[PDB]
């Protein structure tokens, strides 16, 4: 099992998906189309402000 | 380039700490498993293995 | 002064090279769901209008 943790903006919280394209989705982290597993997202505006 | 955050930023610009779990469930030696109690092993009898 | 829903503000777009990647800073973008045209490789399409 592999876990990867980072931070992204709200408009791109759904940008991370297998085969998505944009800035992050193709330049900083992509998920392969056959990726199995899932992503976890929550707001950290209280702390990262 | 700078990726600063301000608490005055609204939804879609607040920081979103994202963690993704990647699995590799396939025919390969198992190391991570759930909390299923292993029972005694039986042979030559039809059993839901 | 965005128009009310009952009288929506329609705009004509003419000959132009429109980059659908610089607009990402123009709004919070709470939801960016899209139909048959995915926004991912949207900058590689030519439209009648
Ligand atoms: C619909 O289009 C725009 C979007 O709000 C409104 O604003 C003007 O649009 C014209 C083009 O049609 C531009 O040339 C102007 O620069 C825009 N601004 C102003 C202040 O005129 C337009 O008024 C809207 N039309 C309506 C509501 O009937």
From Swiss-Prot, chain C:
Record-given protein name: Spike protein S1
Main function: Attaches the virion to the cell membrane by interacting with host receptor, initiating the infection. The major receptor is host ACE2. When S2/S2' has been cleaved, binding to the receptor triggers direct fusion at the cell membrane. When S2/S2' has not been cleaved, binding to the receptor results in internalization of the virus by endocytosis using host TFRC and GRM2 and leading to fusion of the virion membrane with the host endosomal membrane. Alternatively, may use NRP1/NRP2 and integrin as entry receptors.
Subunit record text: Binds to host ACE2. RBD also interacts with the N-linked glycan on 'Asn-90' of ACE2. Cleavage of S generates a polybasic C-terminal sequence on S1 that binds to host Neuropilin-1 (NRP1) and Neuropilin-2 (NRP2) receptors. Interacts with host integrin alpha-5/beta-1 (ITGA5:ITGB1) and with ACE2 in complex with integrin alpha-5/beta-1 (ITGA5:ITGB1). May interact via cytoplasmic c-terminus with M protein. May interact (via N-terminus) with host bilirubin and biliverdin, thereby preventing antibody binding to the SARS-CoV-2 spike NTD via an allosteric mechanism.
Effect caused by changing residue 1 to T: In strain: Omicron/BQ.1.1, Omicron/XBB.1.5, Omicron/EG.5.1
Effect upon mutating residue 1 to K: In strain: Mu/B.1.621
């Amino acid at each position: 099992v592999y876990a990867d943790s980072f931070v992204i903006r709200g408009n791109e919280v759904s940008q991370i998906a297998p085969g998505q394209t944009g800035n992050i989705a193709d330049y900083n982290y992509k998920l392969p189309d056959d990726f199995t597993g899932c992503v976890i997202a929550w707001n950290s505006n209280k702390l990262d402000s | 380039q700078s990726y600063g955050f301000r608490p005055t930023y609204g939804v879609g610009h607040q920081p979103y700490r994202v963690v993704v779990l990647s699995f590799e469930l396939l025919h390969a030696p198992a190391t991570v498993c759930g909390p299923k109690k292993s029972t005694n092993l039986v042979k030559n009898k039809c059993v839901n293995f | 002064r965005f128009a009310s829903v009952y009288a929506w503000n329609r705009t004509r777009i003419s000959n132009c090279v429109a980059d659908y990647s610089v607009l990402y800073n123009f709004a919070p973008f709470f939801a960016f769901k899209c139909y048959g045209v995915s926004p991912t490789k949207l900058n590689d399409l030519c439209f009648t209008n």
